[PDB]
Amino acid sequence: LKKQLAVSVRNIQWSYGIFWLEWGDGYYNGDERSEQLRELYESLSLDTEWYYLVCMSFVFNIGEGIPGGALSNGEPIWLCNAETADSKVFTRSLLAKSASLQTVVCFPFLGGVLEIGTTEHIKEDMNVIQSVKTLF
């Protein structure tokens, strides 16, 4: 799915993407590098680049977090003003403040959940969740 995530985030022009229960794979596409990212994390395991990697063990059960809430509810969870959100449903709150991300979106797809995010204001536009699937 590494290619199918790279083709997705680069075209929609968001900064990162995560497929998810533990990680699946991810793709960075903001302002070689994704690869640079996995190598280091696995190396250390005994601004946005921080965000992306620190996710790697942000693993939630059914209902917990944004992935778990999208999987068990079966619906996308679009999230605005990520740099002031609350931790009741958006578990990596203080981690998103770090890099001035505004929106984070997570939705069920392909028997898992796909997450997408950017550092700009995007009014809830659900045809771009149709773009990730069609383009894949």
Binding site: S45, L46, V54, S87, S93, L94, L95
Partner: peptide, 14 residues
């Protein structure tokens, strides 16, 4: 505060 020590735990793990 439950939020911030999530990050300290992993940041210490790396």
């Amino acid at each position: 505060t439950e939020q911030e020590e999530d990050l300290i735990i992993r940041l210490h793990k790396l």
